[PDB]
Design a protein around this ligand. Structure first.
Ligand SMILES: C[N+](C)(C)CCOP(=O)(O)O
Length: 258
């Protein structure tokens, strides 16, 4: 299954901790806390709001949203191990819930959420399933609700080089263009669809992370291994190179139900 693939490879316990080291405490999403602050900078919610976080990971996003706004946050992630980790980092807070489930089968009421939020998680879904997911999101949003997404995107497949092809294949990602992604949202009837190619900003975030990794190599080696360091270092190097030339892209999407 997809769950087994993710838990046994990219998102083993150790894989998750390695990612957390570079992204920052409670994050496996690009730019950790700082990108979260920026992405939510024009979003308004309050203590009565209901938020869904698709691919909630280590829970930092939900923690931040609940801290900033006092909103109810419900995170869903397919990896049981990551959800277990997230649940270890929050206590005594009845407005944060993390649930291990498949978002493609999970049931939520129509007109339920003020915000549906997702950070670098939908890349794992096939194109067919991306469309199915956004149809569900449309239903699940309140009439007054907002959809807010970042995700890994790419140039057209015809332009990919050997190394990028191998990365996408090994990861089992389905990476589409920012423009194709926006078109899915439009096709799902979302209004006010705003898409931004934030590859340059993503490149900046990657550079901050890369510098951090290099400056904290000794600590990393104590926690992990040189082999894992090299893999991480090389992985960020490629993302930096590929975002600079727009082969690997970072898409931002915001839309509304009405
Ligand atoms: C996709 N992610 C941002 C959740 C984790 C990192 O994946 P990757 O950049 O190593 O492919």
């Amino acid at each position: 299954s997809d769950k087994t693939f993710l838990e046994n490879n990219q998102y083993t316990d150790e894989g998750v901790k390695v990612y957390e080291f570079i992204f920052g405490e409670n994050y496996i999403s690009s730019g950790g806390l700082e990108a979260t602050k920026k992405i939510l900078s024009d979003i308004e919610l309050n203590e009565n709001s209901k938020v869904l976080d698709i691919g909630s990971g280590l829970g930092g996003g939900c923690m931040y949203i609940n801290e900033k706004y006092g909103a109810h946050t419900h995170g869903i992630d397919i990896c049981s191990n990551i959800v277990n980790m997230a649940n270890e980092r929050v206590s005594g807070n009845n407005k944060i819930i993390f649930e291990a489930n498949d978002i493609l089968t999970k049931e939520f009421p129509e007109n339920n959420f003020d915000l549906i939020y997702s950070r670098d998680a939908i890349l794992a879904l096939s194109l067919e399933n991306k469309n199915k997911l956004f149809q569900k999101c449309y239903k699940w949003l309140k009439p007054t609700g907002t959809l807010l997404i970042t995700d890994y995107c790419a140039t057209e497949k015809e332009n990919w080089d050997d190394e990028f092809k191998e990365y996408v294949k090994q990861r089992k990602y389905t990476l589409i263009t920012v423009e194709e992604y926006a078109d899915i949202l439009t096709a799902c009837n979302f209004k006010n669809v705003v898409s931004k190619d934030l590859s340059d900003y993503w490149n900046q975030l990657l550079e901050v992370e890369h510098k951090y990794l290099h400056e904290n190599k000794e600590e990393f080696l104590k926690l992990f291994s040189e082999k894992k360091f090299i893999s991480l270092d090389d992985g960020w190097s490629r993302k930096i190179k590929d975002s600079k030339r727009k082969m690997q892209r970072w898409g931002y999407f915001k839309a509304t139900k009405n």
